[PDB]
Structures are given as C-alpha cells and as structure tokens.
Amino acid sequence: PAYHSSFLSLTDVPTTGNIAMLPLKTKFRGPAYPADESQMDIIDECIGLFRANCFFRNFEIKGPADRTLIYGTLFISECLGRVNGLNYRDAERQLNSLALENFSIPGSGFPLNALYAPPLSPQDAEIMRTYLTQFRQELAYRLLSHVYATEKDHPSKWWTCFSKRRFMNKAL
Amino acid sequence: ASFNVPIIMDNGTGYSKLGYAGNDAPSYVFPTVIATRSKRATEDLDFFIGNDALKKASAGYSLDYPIRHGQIENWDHMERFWQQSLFKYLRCEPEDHYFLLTEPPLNPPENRENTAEIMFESFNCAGLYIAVQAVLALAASWTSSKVTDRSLTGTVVDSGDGVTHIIPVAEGYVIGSSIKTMPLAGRDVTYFVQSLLRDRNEPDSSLKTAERIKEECCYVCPDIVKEFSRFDREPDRYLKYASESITGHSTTIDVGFERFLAPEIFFNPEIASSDFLTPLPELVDNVVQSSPIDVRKGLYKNIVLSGGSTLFKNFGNRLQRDLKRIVDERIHRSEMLSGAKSGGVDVNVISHKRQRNAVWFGGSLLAQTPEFGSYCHTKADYEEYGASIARRYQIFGNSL
Amino acid sequence: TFRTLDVDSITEPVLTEQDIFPIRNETAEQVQAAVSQLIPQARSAIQTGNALQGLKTLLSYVPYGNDVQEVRTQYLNAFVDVLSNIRAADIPAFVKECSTEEIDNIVNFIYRGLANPQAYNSSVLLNWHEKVVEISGIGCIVRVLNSRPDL
Amino acid sequence: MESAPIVLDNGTGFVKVGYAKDNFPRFQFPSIVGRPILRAEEKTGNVQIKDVMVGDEAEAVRSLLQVKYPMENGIIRDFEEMNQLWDYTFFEKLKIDPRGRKILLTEPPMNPVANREKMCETMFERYGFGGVYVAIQAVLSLYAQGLSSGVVVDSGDGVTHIVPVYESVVLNHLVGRLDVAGRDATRYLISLLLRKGYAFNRTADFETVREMKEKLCYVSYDLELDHKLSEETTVLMRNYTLPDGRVIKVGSERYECPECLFQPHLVGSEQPGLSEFIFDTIQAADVDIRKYLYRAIVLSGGSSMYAGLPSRLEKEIKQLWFERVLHGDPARLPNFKVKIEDAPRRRHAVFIGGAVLADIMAQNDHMWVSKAEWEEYGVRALDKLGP
Amino acid sequence: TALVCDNGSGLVKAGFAGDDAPRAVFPSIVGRPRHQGVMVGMGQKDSYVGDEAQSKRGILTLKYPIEHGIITNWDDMEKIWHHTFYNELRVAPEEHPTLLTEAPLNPKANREKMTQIMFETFNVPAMYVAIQAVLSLYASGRTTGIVLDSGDGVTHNVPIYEGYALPHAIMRLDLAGRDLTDYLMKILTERGYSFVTTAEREIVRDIKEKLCYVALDFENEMATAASSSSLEKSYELPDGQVITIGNERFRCPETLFQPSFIGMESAGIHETTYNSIMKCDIDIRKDLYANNVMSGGTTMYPGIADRMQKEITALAPSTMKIKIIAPPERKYSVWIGGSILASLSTFQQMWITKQEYDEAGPSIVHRKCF
Numbered sequence A: 001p002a003y004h005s006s007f008l009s010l011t012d013v014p015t016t017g018n019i020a021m022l023p024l025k026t027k028f029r030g031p032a033y034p035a036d037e038s039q040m041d042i043i044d045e046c047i048g049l050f051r052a053n054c055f056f057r058n059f060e061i062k063g064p065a066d067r068t069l070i071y072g073t074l075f076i077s078e079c080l081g082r083v084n085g086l087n088y089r090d091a092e093r094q095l096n097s098l099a100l101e102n103f104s105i106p107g108s109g110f111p112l113n114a115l116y117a118p119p120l121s122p123q124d125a126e127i128m129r130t131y132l133t134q135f136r137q138e139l140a141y142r143l144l145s146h147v148y149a150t151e152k153d154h155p156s157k158w159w160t161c162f163s164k165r166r167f168m169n170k171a172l
Numbered sequence B: 001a002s003f004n005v006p007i008i009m010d011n012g013t014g015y016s017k018l019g020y021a022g023n024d025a026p027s028y029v030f031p032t033v034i035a036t037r038s039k040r041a042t043e044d045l046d047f048f049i050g051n052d053a054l055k056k057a058s059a060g061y062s063l064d065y066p067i068r069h070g071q072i073e074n075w076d077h078m079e080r081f082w083q084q085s086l087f088k089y090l091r092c093e094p095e096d097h098y099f100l101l102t103e104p105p106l107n108p109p110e111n112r113e114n115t116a117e118i119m120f121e122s123f124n125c126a127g128l129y130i131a132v133q134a135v136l137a138l139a140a141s142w143t144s145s146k147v148t149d150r151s152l153t154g155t156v157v158d159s160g161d162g163v164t165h166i167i168p169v170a171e172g173y174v175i176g177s178s179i180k181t182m183p184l185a186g187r188d189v190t191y192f193v194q195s196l197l198r199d200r201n202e203p204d205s206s207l208k209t210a211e212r213i214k215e216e217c218c219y220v221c222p223d224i225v226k227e228f229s230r231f232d233r234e235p236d237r238y239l240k241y242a243s244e245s246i247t248g249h250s251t252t253i254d255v256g257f258e259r260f261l262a263p264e265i266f267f268n269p270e271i272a273s274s275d276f277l278t279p280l281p282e283l284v285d286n287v288v289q290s291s292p293i294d295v296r297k298g299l300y301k302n303i304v305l306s307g308g309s310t311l312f313k314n315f316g317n318r319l320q321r322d323l324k325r326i327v328d329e330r331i332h333r334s335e336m337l338s339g340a341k342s343g344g345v346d347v348n349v350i351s352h353k354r355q356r357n358a359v360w361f362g363g364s365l366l367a368q369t370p371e372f373g374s375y376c377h378t379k380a381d382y383e384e385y386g387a388s389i390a391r392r393y394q395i396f397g398n399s400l
Numbered sequence C: 001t002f003r004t005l006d007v008d009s010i011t012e013p014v015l016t017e018q019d020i021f022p023i024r025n026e027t028a029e030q031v032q033a034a035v036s037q038l039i040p041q042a043r044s045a046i047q048t049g050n051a052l053q054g055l056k057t058l059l060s061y062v063p064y065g066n067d068v069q070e071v072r073t074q075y076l077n078a079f080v081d082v083l084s085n086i087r088a089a090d091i092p093a094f095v096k097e098c099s100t101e102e103i104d105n106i107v108n109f110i111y112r113g114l115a116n117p118q119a120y121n122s123s124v125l126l127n128w129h130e131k132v133v134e135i136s137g138i139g140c141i142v143r144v145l146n147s148r149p150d151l
Numbered sequence D: 001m002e003s004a005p006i007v008l009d010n011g012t013g014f015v016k017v018g019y020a021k022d023n024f025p026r027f028q029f030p031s032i033v034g035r036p037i038l039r040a041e042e043k044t045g046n047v048q049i050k051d052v053m054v055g056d057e058a059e060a061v062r063s064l065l066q067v068k069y070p071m072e073n074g075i076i077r078d079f080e081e082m083n084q085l086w087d088y089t090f091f092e093k094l095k096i097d098p099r100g101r102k103i104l105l106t107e108p109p110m111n112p113v114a115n116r117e118k119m120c121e122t123m124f125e126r127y128g129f130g131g132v133y134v135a136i137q138a139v140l141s142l143y144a145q146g147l148s149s150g151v152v153v154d155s156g157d158g159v160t161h162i163v164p165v166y167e168s169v170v171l172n173h174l175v176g177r178l179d180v181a182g183r184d185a186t187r188y189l190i191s192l193l194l195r196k197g198y199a200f201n202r203t204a205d206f207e208t209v210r211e212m213k214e215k216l217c218y219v220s221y222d223l224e225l226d227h228k229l230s231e232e233t234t235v236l237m238r239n240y241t242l243p244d245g246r247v248i249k250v251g252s253e254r255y256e257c258p259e260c261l262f263q264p265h266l267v268g269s270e271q272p273g274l275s276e277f278i279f280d281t282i283q284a285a286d287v288d289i290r291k292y293l294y295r296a297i298v299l300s301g302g303s304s305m306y307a308g309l310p311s312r313l314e315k316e317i318k319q320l321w322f323e324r325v326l327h328g329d330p331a332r333l334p335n336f337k338v339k340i341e342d343a344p345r346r347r348h349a350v351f352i353g354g355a356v357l358a359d360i361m362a363q364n365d366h367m368w369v370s371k372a373e374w375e376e377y378g379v380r381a382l383d384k385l386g387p
Numbered sequence E: 001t002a003l004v005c006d007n008g009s010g011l012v013k014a015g016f017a018g019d020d021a022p023r024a025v026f027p028s029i030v031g032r033p034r035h036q037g038v039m040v041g042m043g044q045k046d047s048y049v050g051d052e053a054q055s056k057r058g059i060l061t062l063k064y065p066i067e068h069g070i071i072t073n074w075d076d077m078e079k080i081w082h083h084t085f086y087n088e089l090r091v092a093p094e095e096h097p098t099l100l101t102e103a104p105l106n107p108k109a110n111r112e113k114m115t116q117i118m119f120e121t122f123n124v125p126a127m128y129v130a131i132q133a134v135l136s137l138y139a140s141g142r143t144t145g146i147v148l149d150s151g152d153g154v155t156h157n158v159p160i161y162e163g164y165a166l167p168h169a170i171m172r173l174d175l176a177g178r179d180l181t182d183y184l185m186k187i188l189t190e191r192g193y194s195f196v197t198t199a200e201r202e203i204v205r206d207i208k209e210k211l212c213y214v215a216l217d218f219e220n221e222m223a224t225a226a227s228s229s230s231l232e233k234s235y236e237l238p239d240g241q242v243i244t245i246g247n248e249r250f251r252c253p254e255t256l257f258q259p260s261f262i263g264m265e266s267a268g269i270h271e272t273t274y275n276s277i278m279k280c281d282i283d284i285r286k287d288l289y290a291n292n293v294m295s296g297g298t299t300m301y302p303g304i305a306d307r308m309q310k311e312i313t314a315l316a317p318s319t320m321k322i323k324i325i326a327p328p329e330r331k332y333s334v335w336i337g338g339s340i341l342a343s344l345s346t347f348q349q350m351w352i353t354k355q356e357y358d359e360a361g362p363s364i365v366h367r368k369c370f
C-alpha cells in the first residue's frame, strides 16, 4: 500500500474541477486559503511522501485531496528533472520559471485526463489555473529548501536521484 | 534397497546446497551457476560450476543460472550442473545411492518429468525423492530428530534467492489447498539494490556488489516514510561501503535509503512487480485463514522462517507485529459483535540457528528415517512406467 | 470409488459392425468349400506359368467374416503367392483391364499382406501398391479405408 | 417500460433485472463496483472515470478500476457498495422512480436472516418501494420450466443449492447448500494457471479469468479419457488472448477447473460435489417420491452451463445408484430412469421464473410485504415470507 | 473379571465388570487424512481412532461406523474394537469374556455379524449381546420402569415390570444427538456461521453440549428471546474467534419434542413415551408413570427432566402420580448396568461360550439373548 493524503479525511474543503483547494502556507499570490504556520499543509505532506510514493506502482485515489497530492507528486518529479547541477541561486529562478510557464490543466495535453474532472465552467478554469500556479510555485520553493538543505551550491544526491523515478510511470 | 547415505541436493535459484543425509552441515554451498563457452566436439566438456565458475568470467566463459524463480528452466545446463555435482564435488556413484532433490510447490509436472528422466536415464541413480522444499524446512526447526522434540504443526515461510512460498503443515500433513507462492525474493531485492546504486550513478553497481550490500547493510524497518525521515535526522545511517572492481582496484559506494527500502520488497511487493500485490504478512494470514478451522491456533503459534532471504535484520519481528496486527484486529471485530472477551491467539515467528539452509537440514533429517527408501521412486518403477511416474503432484489435490 | 464404474456399456447398448455392414448370407462351411475349390486353380496357374490367369480366377470370389480366419489366411497365402509370381512388366497390362470392383479386391488384400511381414514378402506388395494406385487413382485406397472390417 | 412489478435477481456474479412477464432479463451486468486507480498501465482520454463506476460501466473499463464485489457466497458483504449497484440498477439502467413500486427479490435457501432484513430495509428506506417479496432462488427456476415436481439444482457465481419439490410442496428439510460455484472454479482457475506461471492477482484480472473459464472450460465426461488426452496428446491445448493482447496457453486446466463442482476437495472444501450432493438429497426424500425426483432433475444458473455437465451429471448418478443401491449388480440398472432437464435458457431460469411469479401475484396486494407494514412491525413484517 | 463394552452409536464406553464407571470412553470415530501431501517417514498412519481422531481432526475426514444404532461399516468398526481392547483397556481380549450392547428392534444381521466377528477375530472366551434399556434398569436399582434411552444415534422406550419386559410395547425412534447436531449446524446458518466439514460438526456438538437447554415452555422462551438479549450466550471457537448464540440454544433440543422441525413424521419423546405406556396393560400402567428412568447422553440437557414431566403429565390422567428418574450419572447408565449384570453370580451360566458358537454358528445369539 502506497501513502495517501491525510486531507482525504477533511470535508467541506473548496474544490475546482475535482482538485481540492487545500489550505496552504505561502508568500505567492493566488486563491489558496492561509494554513496554520505551525501545521503540515498539503505541500509539507506532498514533499514528505514523494520519496516513498514514487516507488509504488498501484495507487487507488480516495477523493479530491489525493487528486491534489498526485499533481504535487508529479510536479516534484519535474522539479528534480530540472534541478541537476544548479547552484541554489539559479535553481530558485529556474524552478520558479518552470512553475510559472504555460501548462495544461485537467480537461485540456494533460496526462491523467481520464481521472481528473474538467473545469465546471469557463470561470472554473481560471480559479483552477490561479490555484495550480500558486501551488506549484510554493511546491518548487519548498522542495528547494530540502534538496539544498546541507550545502547551497550542489543539489543533495539523496534528493536528485529520484529525477529518473516517475510516479506510477506517469509524468506532466 | 541400498543402505548407503541418501544424497541430498537443494538446488536453489541462488545457491545449490549438496551433501549426504545425517551430516551436520552441507558438504557444499555454492551458486547455481554454470560457466560455458560463448577437431572433435568438446564445448560440452569445457564447462565449470559453483565457486569455481565465478573465476571464469574473465577467462571468456559466459555464466548462466539454470534455475530461475525456483524452477529449472534450462535442461541442458541443469543436466551438466548435476553431472559435475555428482562426479566432481560429491564424487559419488549414482547406482549405489538414493537421491533427495527439492523443488518449489507450484513447479510444473514437466519439470518433475525432466528431473526424473535425467536422474534415471542419464545418471542411472538407485532411486529419487523430489521433495517440496518448504515441507522439509519445518524439520530444521526441531531441537533434535527424536520423536519427543518434534512439533508437526506450523506455518513455514520459505524465501530464497528466487521464490518465496508459505506452506501450512498440520499434524505432519501439508495443507495443499492453502499454499501461497510469490516469485519475488533474494534476487529481485538485489536487482532493486542494484537499480538504486545505478540511479545514483555510484562507481560500481555489478550484481556481486548489490548481493553484498543486501547482507552487509540492509534491514527491515517499521515503516518507510518514517525511515526516510530518520535518514534526514540521523546522518550516520548513510553507510560507506568499500567495493573492489572486477578488474582489481578499489572504489567507495555510499549506501542510502536502500538500507531499508530494499527489504521492504517483501512487506510491499508493489515496489517490485505489478502482478504480486499482496504483502507477506497478509499473504500469511490468507494461508492460515484458508486452512481448516481447528489447526489455526497451531499454525499461528509456530510460523517457521526459512531460506537465506528471511535473514534480514528485524525481518522476524516485522512479520510477527504486522501479522499480530492483522490477527488481533480480526479477533477484536468478533469480540465487538459478541460483547464477550476472547483468549486471543499467540503468534510466534520462529527464527532459529539453521534458518540459512533449513530445506537441506530438513531433507537430511527426513532421509535418515528407515522408511525413506519406500517413499522414493525406485529405478525398478522407472523401468516399468517411465518418467511419467514423477508427473503427479504429491502436495495438491489431484482429480483421478 | 464410484467414478470409475462404467454404466454406458449396460444402459446404452452401442452399434455393432453387423448393423453398419450387412451380415454375410453364405454359411461358414459354404464359403470354406467355395474357397477350397479356388485355391487349387490358383496353385495350378503358378505351376503352368500363367500366374496372371491365376490372379484373374482367384480374385473372382473373396472370403469375409469373423467366423473364417482359418480360410481368409489361406486365401491371403494364395493371393500373396500369386502376386509374388507375376512379372513386374505385366502388372500395368493386368491393372488397366481390371474392373473397379476387382481393383478394390486387390488393394484390400495387399493391405492384409502388408499387415503380416513375418509371413509375407512386403517388397512385392509395395510394388503392386505403387502400380495399382498410379494406374487407377487415389480413390482405390479410400474404398479400402471405408471397406468392411471383416475383410 | 412497464406498470407491473419490477423483478431483480441480484446474483453474486450478475445482476439481472426487468419486469413481470419478461421472457428474458431486460438488462444484466456484472455485480461489480469500482473506484479509480492508476497502475503502471495504459491511460486514455477515450473515457472519463467517475468516483464510483459500476456494472457495465466498470467491466468495460476495468483496466482503470479497483474492481470489488458487493457479494460472496450469495450474501452482501458490503452494503455501501451494494447501494451503488442498486442506485445504478434503478436510476440509470431501468431509469425508474421507485416511490411506491412493487419489486420481487431473490436469495439462496440458507442465508443469514440479517441479509434479508437489511436488503428489505434498504428497499423500503433508500428507494421507498411500496411492496417487496423475496423468493428462494431455486423455487423460481421451477416456475420457468412450467413445472411442479422434480429436484431443482441451481449453480450460480456464488453458491450451488438444491431444492426438492413434489406436487407443488417444497421440502424445506432437504434444501441444501454446496458452498462451491462459478467463483470457486474461477479462484481455482487462477490457481491452476499460477502453476504455469501466469499471474492474475490484480482485482481487475478476475473478470478476465471469468471470461476465460466461460469461453474455454468443459466438464470431462470420463476422467481417465481426458487425463489420456491431457497427458498423451496435444489436442486439448487452446490459445486465449487477454484484453492486454497477451496470449496464454491453456490445456488440462480446461477440464480440471470445472471438475471442482464434482470434486470440491480440489478447492479445499470437504463437501460432496454435484452428483453425490444431488444423490444424497434425493435419497433422503421419502420412499414414495424418489422416482418423481430422479425422473426430473432440473439444472439452473450460469455455473450449470459447462459443456458436458448435463451428460456427466446423468452418468454420475446412474454410476452412483449402481454403487450405493444395487451394490454393483448390473441386472437392475436399465430400470433406473434418471432424466436431467438442461434447457437452453437455464442460466436465466431464476430471473425468467421470477418474472413468471411476479405476474402470478402482481394484483394480490396482501401477498407482498408493504412499506406501510414494514414501517410498523420492522423486521417482523418479513415473517409473511414462509418458514 | 469380564469386559463390558458399550457399542456407543457416537461414544464408545469400555471397562471391567464391577468397576463403577467406564475405564475408557472415547468417540466411535474412524478418521482418515484428507490430504495426500506428507512429511515422509514422520509418524503418519492411514486411520486415526477415538481421541487420535478428535485431537487431529482439522486434517481428517471423520466417519462414525455406527449410524442409527446399526453398524454400516464393518472393516472400520473392528478398528474401534481393536482400539478398545489393545490401546484403551490394554488387555488381550482372549483372556476375558465380553458383554456387548445393542438397541431394541435392530437388524438381526447386525447382532449376527457382531457375534461372528467377536469370536472369529478377537477369540473371546464367551460373550453376550444385551439390550441397552434393560441394562440401564440395573444401574437405576429397580425391577419396574419405562426406561427412555437417548443416545447419539437412537432413542427408545422399554416398558418393563418385575423383570418381565413388554416387547410389543417397545418404541424406537431414529432421532438423537446426531440429528440434534445436524439441526444445530442447519439453524446456526441464520446467524451467518457456516459449518460444513466433519471436523466442524464436532465444534457444533461441543456448542450443543455446553450451551443448549430444553425450554420448559417453547413458545414462551421464543417470545422471551425476541424480547431481550438476556437469553444470548457466547462460545470461543478453536480459532480464538467468538460465536454468539440465542434462541438456537433451545430450538435445537426442541427437535426431540417436535420431530417436524427436521421434517420427520413422528411423535416427540413425550407422546412416544405416553403411547408406549398406553400400549401396556392397565394394571401395569399405574406404576410405570412413577418410574420413567432416563438414559444416554441426549437425556442430559438442562431443563429436560422438568419439561419431560410437564408434557407427560398433560397426557397422563390427573389421578396418577408421575415421576422422572434422571440420575446425575445417566450418561453411562447402560455401561454401569452392564458392569452390574456381568458381575452377578446368577448370570455366569448364560454367556454364549466359544464352545457353543462352534456347534451352531452366529445364529445361536437369537436364542441365548433377548
């Protein structure tokens, strides 16, 4: 059994397509509601689980918090695909550029388009894009504090070697 | 019948263990490998086997492993491996001795037929017993061969280099309707250790180095998302291993999260395969619950571990706690519906001194019994009925 | 246990070869007389060298039935002896003049001669088999496959 | 669709559904529920996976689903999943408003009473059916035959069960379960194929080996003959292509698999198989009626469809009266008339019989348990439904 | 000394005459292994009997060679006698004469093949084949009575008066501790517990022995069990798993009073006893109401002796004084009775000796025995 999100037990959380707009700790501009600064929000969960969840090859999705965790678990693999050989001062800028560049949302090019509900309206697509850009900017910034933990000029190999690993053999 | 000590051969996917019944260890334990070439024809005489065939990779021979997933699957190589075992290492005469051979529970009838015709027509041995290997491994558990030390009811978990299977046996009978088998063991966890060294791009990732990192450095943790987190908090857990290359020079390997994530293949086999999804503690509960009701207290009370790939540090305790968690959760569901208490069930997973080769010690201990010559296919039965005499499963229920 | 006890043999009586082929009308001693008068004509035709007129007369009647092995074997002995005494260059002149009924009596008995090599020379029967099938066509073997089993 | 009673054979392997007087099921589909999963397998924009996927929608798409079965052995294991079959059955197969409708349900002859209670409670309190009736599945299969005597044996996906009947009286002391049927033969087919090295242990692969069993298996008429063809000859070997495109060779597993209905010990059950179970049931009936049972054994249910099963069963009862009543004396065997009824429709005989019975009692409003009677007596309202 | 061997239709009881209880007592079972796969040479054998069959039962198929008091399987019944003599009593049988037991109205060919195989194999000096109910009368210490035996396989009434037995008044019914166990295996399905193996039948027997009781009035206990969980009890399987059981505790024994619960056409044991005493002559009927002796393990349930009285007093006329004699040792009363009989000074002339079997063959037993 792979590790599912803690937030699938949460209820009446806001939703877009069928992503969960889970509480977030961040500085980036966007629609995600502030988390408690003392608590693990979905990005501390997604970074904590990623290195275990990308070895499994069979993952049942319980609800919209797992659909969110999967998008995070896939975007960590894109970031570790980018980061090889960078200085932290370059990696911040390269992975923010990766986070902000134009991407396909579910319902548009998207790999898991079989499992994610398309946006409910022309307006739901914008609240989805402005969430997923805020999410993946924070996810990149948070990840970099782990991969450049002990030394600031060389990505720690214990994080970089998952760049070949690929959650359930899917990628963005 | 001849009186000579029956010869015992546990041909594993990893190691062949060879010897004579009634000795206190195998005469040989060496890899199930054959080195072959890749005006008279002699390329079928030039081969080598075992520890003397690892020395031959640099002399331009191709090593191949004729047993894969616990089954013989090259019959040319296995016949040459047996002739060389019998006439070089065991140095015996087949016409004088009964042989105990071993195979997994779910082997095809075709492999017992091929084993029988090779033994009776090529070597001409006096008689043959083809034992289901985990049924023997129970008999290594006893404190002695004597009748008062026996405990003929217990689940036996066997895990070698090529197959793991769980056999329930009760009152000396193998409960064949309940055998579970999974072709994921000591080699599949080596290919996973090898796969990790290779993704980190370490200086050496040859099979012999992943094989050594398993048994030097790896262990079974309680839970991998806490163990990944511990490897951040506790940086002395990244061991450094010194490996010497095929061409005779030093290297150094950092060993990482494969120290726990590799043995986790047994307790989460989704890491290794899309096909075998059930983890070993739940695979054991499926054995004991499929088994008839009155033996279940006895089958949980004595879960014997066997075969080299069960030796990982903390393997017995992980299996005991995860199986005890499955079992007391199911009993507590039943206390809930009744409102009454229960006496529960004790689950003991038995690691023991002969665990590394338990199938051989089981075969040795059984073959000493005066009745053994009557359980063999004698070559007189072979000359009457041919190699089809070995085709019937002893273990499973057969129609007809 | 019960699984092996056959019941079909005692509750559903199967057909017999005499239901599929009509039973012979001539009695055993009536055919044993009819053959024993012909074999001396065939033995005589060898002794006077006209062995081909031996076959033409021997082949004018055929014994059949599960009651007559002790004279079907004597008829086969005379037939194989007559086939062993016809010159190989005369065979194509005999076979092209046989009726399709006589041909289907020749090839039927050469497949009885080929069934017992420890008493009959196969080499001359295989030679007759090549020549009778090459001249008269493959259907002459199909009429043997389909023929009565007590021939 | 129709104003008459709805009828529902919620079987262990297939739901079949329609109305009174239907000559064949209006719909049938696997009794399966699935949840979305990703699995190191193909993904496609050709289909959209909703949070709960069921029946035909799941079975057509099951590479993408964690398939689960709400029933085993003829009992509902998980009512949250059976609710997701019943929602689908009424709201998007039949397309019905159940408010005040009358429905006929079925269950096997020896179920836990808590199963019938919670199944009727659900009909009155999720859907609000105005009337419910529950019939023993094998007595329905006797209305399909237009018949009133002769022992009826039903073998489904979940359970094989037998109900002797004589002159319209149902012999409740002789009704019996053999807990071996079409699913135990399927778990056994997986276990036979595992000896060849083919693994089918994903939840979605179970429907593939059901389709394989249903396509290729047959009941051996003479075991030493099929063991001859099996061991001496290639003639049994057959190639099956999975929905993956993989081809797998299957041989002795064609006869050796459905043999577990005749020999339950192959699947670890100590019970006697079909021939010995039907014999020990007929031979337990009173002396005056045994003739009228052997003269009309009625087969029913999908697991009675294996090629050769009618002929093997008839032989194996002639063969067994011969051992156990004649002691091997051939003199009387021709006097033993046994007849198996094995009609073309028989997979659906429980539904076709239910659709006949639901016409016989459509207008007799006191014959059903009414919602108004359920809501005053609770579970005790079901005591209307016989002994 | 003489041996006394009760041929229990489910529970064999063996011992020496004058001893006050069976020296050994064990299930009348022969069990065979249901698995062919074996640890070779490791002490297995092709038949386990009595307590070897019970303690090993999970891997065995168990079959009793007695059904309804008739031996159905002779090649296996002699294994049980071999066990009674050589493994339980630990004697040579050829040194000691054997008193055997039989039900009334049994096939005479059963008693013939029993007396045949007992001399022709075990070579006992002498033997006898007494009826179980007249044996039970000796253990009760009286000369008048209407013994109601109720074993594993049979139940029967033998009206008996000053030693004159009434063979026209005997009743026998094939309803007993086996059929009550079949019906418990059937009705427990309603809880969702499925028992089907001949091993699990022994679990359902142990439930029936520990938890079942006779309702004093059935449709009042049925109403009480529906009204509250006050009547429910729990049992722990040989698996640590827990069973809960309720009105099934008394619906099982009620079958003995209502055979129509198992579809069988018969009077219950109250009506069968009444119709047996009402078949005796009116001078005797005055006394046998005061002497309903009970015997055999199916007469052992809690509440049976009181409910047996409340039923039989509704059939008997109110002027009579009506009593059930149910000893605390009643399970063994036929064996204690045989132990008394085989010890009598006056009995020793009426054994069948080996000498007079040779003069007549087994059909002598029909004149030497009742």
Ligand SMILES: Nc1ncnc2c1ncn2[C@@H]1O[C@H](COP(=O)(O)OP(=O)(O)OP(=O)(O)O)[C@@H](O)[C@H]1O
Pocket (backbone or CB within 6 Å): D010, D011, D012, D013, D014, D015, D073, D074, D137, D155, D156, D157, D158, D159, D160, D181, D182, D183, D210, D211, D213, D214, D215, D217, D301, D302, D303, D304, D305, D306, D307, D347
């Ligand atoms: N031709 C066939 N050959 C083999 N098996 C068949 C065949 N046709 C149907 N089956 C099997 O029958 C089962 C489905 O039959 P059916 O619908 O009668 O079962 P069910 O009613 O759902 O089960 P149950 O009555 O136990 O609840 C499946 O196992 C299916 O594979």
Ligand SMILES: Nc1ncnc2c1ncn2[C@@H]1O[C@H](COP(=O)(O)OP(=O)(O)O)[C@@H](O)[C@H]1O
Pocket (backbone or CB within 6 Å): B011, B012, B013, B014, B015, B016, B159, B160, B161, B162, B163, B185, B186, B187, B211, B214, B215, B307, B308, B309, B310, B311, B312, B313, B356, B357
């Ligand atoms: N201490 C150990 N810890 C983990 N694995 C071990 C240990 N010692 C040996 N092994 C492994 O045991 C396997 C060999 O076990 P064996 O019983 O001989 O298997 P097989 O019979 O299939 O050849 C190899 O994978 C080997 O690396």
Ligand SMILES: Nc1ncnc2c1ncn2[C@@H]1O[C@H](COP(=O)(O)OP(=O)(O)O)[C@@H](O)[C@H]1O
Pocket (backbone or CB within 6 Å): E006, E007, E008, E009, E010, E011, E012, E150, E151, E152, E153, E154, E176, E177, E178, E205, E208, E209, E295, E296, E297, E298, E300, E301, E302, E331
């Ligand atoms: N305490 C008890 N309460 C209820 N039933 C009992 C009790 N003890 C034993 N039994 C019943 O006793 C039966 C055996 O009775 P027994 O007289 O020894 O029969 P038999 O002599 O014919 O072998 C068993 O079938 C069992 O059902």
Ligand code: BEF
Pocket (backbone or CB within 6 Å): B011, B012, B013, B014, B069, B070, B159, B160, B161, B162, B163, B164, B185, B307
């Ligand atoms: F082949 Be080893 F026994 F796994």
Ligand SMILES: [Mg+2]
Pocket (backbone or CB within 6 Å): B011, B012, B013, B133, B159, B160, B161, B307, B359
């Ligand atoms: Mg091994």
Ligand SMILES: [Mg+2]
Pocket (backbone or CB within 6 Å): D011, D012, D137, D155, D156, D157, D301, D350
């Ligand atoms: Mg059905």
Ligand SMILES: [Mg+2]
Pocket (backbone or CB within 6 Å): E007, E008, E009, E010, E150, E151, E152, E296
């Ligand atoms: Mg008794």
